[PDB]
Amino acid sequence: EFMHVFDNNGIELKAECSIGEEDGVYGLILESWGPGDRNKDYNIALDYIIERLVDSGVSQVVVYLASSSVRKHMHSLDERKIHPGEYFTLIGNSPRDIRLKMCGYQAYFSRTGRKEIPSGNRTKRILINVPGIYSDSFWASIIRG
DNA sequence: TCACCGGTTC
DNA sequence: GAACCGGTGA
């Protein structure tokens, strides 16, 4: 029932995902890491996603916090956008460093709202959008490798 | 039961 | 500061 991200050798990572419309936004949803080994390749899978997006000519994305808790308590889609600007930038650093910047923003959320000081888990359920892309074929290529 | 993220371990 | 564990409330 869940799709997965595949590594550069075509091996399936422990990283559940799905492609579709959620809260009016079309994109890739990467499921959360935890407990234990549930989706433990979150970070590697997300590194590949960023790298492959860049190789496909995508320089900017929009990333929403999409955990059941945050969706429940933060009704505003604009507030659920993890980064302060309109877009998040995928170029100018290594895919790893870009991920660190991206996932640092997840630390500003709690169960019920935003925080002052970022803390806690950074590997939560997120929705990545590429502006102008409404196609599962594109996203299929990105997660397949 | 399950995905949630707080909080400890790296 | 980031990776990971596992306790938690629904």
Residue numbers in the entry: -1 to 143
What is the paper's account of this structure, in its own sentences?
The enzyme consists of a novel N-terminal specificity domain that we term NEco, and a C-terminal catalytic HNH domain. We determined the crystal structures of NEco in complex with fully modified DNA containing three variants of the Y5mCGR EcoKMcrA target sequence: C5mCGG, T5mCGA and T5hmCGA.
The purified NEco was co-crystallized with 10mer dsDNA with the central C5mCGG, T5mCGA and T5hmCGA sequences. When Y is a cytosine, the N4 atom of the C is about 3.3 Å away from peptide bond between G32 and P33. The C5mCGG sequence used before for in vivo and in vitro characterization of EcoKMcrA and NEco exhibited ∼7-fold weaker binding. The data indicate an ∼230-fold preference for fully over hemi-methylated DNA and ∼10-fold preference for hemi- over non-methylated DNA. The binding pocket for the (hydroxy)methyl group in the proximal strand is a locally hydrophobic region, formed by the Cβ atom of S30 and a part of K122 (atoms Cα, Cβ and Cγ). The binding pocket for the (hydroxy)methyl group in the distal strand is primarily formed by the indole ring of W31.
